[PDB]
């Protein structure tokens, strides 16, 4: 629960990317010119009013002041998109000069600043992309072990979504094996963008190849996850870390908004939108209302603010 402040760089020499500071003095860690890399930069509100006064006297950059008691990633994003009237925001830079312990945002991509040069743009969409992420084992499939397409209308809706550029990101928690069968069984991949498996579990991380099935080009479902929280509970959230990682692997570096669609609300750590799939032992053809919901969710920013 804190007041907050943000730089807005005057000359957007690099766009969209934003940073978070532990010190007003961190400018010294940044040195010359590199501030021109970061369109906006958030800092916790000054305790001493003289700091804010000197800031107010500085003309080198624009700035904003606000409250964000809501210590949440997506809520902060929403607030900032309001403040600067911008639908999209870049990645958050980090340094070995360790960030302020705003670790409530822990689960996120962190850019070690120098990768800024590594920031290629990408072809993959001519519009700014929306993204939707999915699961197999109990998400949208029929509950029969031989799953069925709930609706061929959905089957073609898959391709239709390309009209809007909605990117389609399956992460089955189930092993690669059932996906290996599913692929041959139904060319949803022929309608569908990105696939991942093995998400079921988290491993006790501590400091102490699949192509052969049919000559595929598919990912090593590597052990990229970590304990991350090391606490007495049993949650396997969908991971923006891995997700964005794969996105930048696809050179996907920006997005409008991302929705998770799954049967498990718990994994949603404040995703933009969550679609609790209605588990079904029949092809329900319920997709019509799911469509409508998602469309309205998209429209939310037609007003320039999600609400």
């Amino acid at each position: 629960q804190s007041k907050w402040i943000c730089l807005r760089l005057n000359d957007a020499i690099i766009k969209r990317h934003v940073l978070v500071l532990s010190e007003y003095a961190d400018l010294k860690y940044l040195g010359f010119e590199k501030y021109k890399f970061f369109e906006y930069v958030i800092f916790q509100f000054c305790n001493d009013p003289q700091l804010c006064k000197i800031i107010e006297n500085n003309y080198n950059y624009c700035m904003q002041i606000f409250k964000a008691p809501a210590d949440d990633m997506r809520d902060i994003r929403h607030n900032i998109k309001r403040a600067f009237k911008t639908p999209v925001l870049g990645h958050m830079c980090v340094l070995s000069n360790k960030p302020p312990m705003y670790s409530f945002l822990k689960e996120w991509f962190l850019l070690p600043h120098y990768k800024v040069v590594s920031l290629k743009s990408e072809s993959l969409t001519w519009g700014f992309p929306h993204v939707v992420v999915f699961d197999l084992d109990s998400t949208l499939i029929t509950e029969e072990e031989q799953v069925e397409i709930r609706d061929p209308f959905v089957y073609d809706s898959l391709q239709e979504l390309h009209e809007m550029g909605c990117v389609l990101v399956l992460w089955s928690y189930g092993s690669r094996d059932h996906v290996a069968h599913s692929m041959r069984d139904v060319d949803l991949e022929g309608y569908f963008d990105i696939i991942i498996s093995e998400g079921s579990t988290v491993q006790e991380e501590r400091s102490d190849i699949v192509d052969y099935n049919l000559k595929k080009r598919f990912i090593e479902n590597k052990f990229v996850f970590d304990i991350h929280n090391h606490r007495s509970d049993n949650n396997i959230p969908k991971s923006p870390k891995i997700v964005i990682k794969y996105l930048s692997d696809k050179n996907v570096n920006f997005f409008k908004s991302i929705t998770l669609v799954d049967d498990l609300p718990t994994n949603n750590y404040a995703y933009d939108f969550y679609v609790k799939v209605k588990r079904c032992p029949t092809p329900v053809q319920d997709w019509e209302h799911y469509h409508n919901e998602i469309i309205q969710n998209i429209m939310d920013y037609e007003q320039y603010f999600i609400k």
């Binding site: 010294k28 860690y29 040195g31 070995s96 000069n97």
Partner: peptide, 21 residues
């Protein structure tokens, strides 16, 4: 570099010495 700003600090001490003379 994480020392680069310190090299700049060395530049600063240098210039501080220089300008007086």
């Amino acid at each position: 570099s994480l020392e680069s700003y310190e090299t700049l600090k060395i530049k600063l001490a240098l210039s501080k010495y220089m300008a007086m003379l």
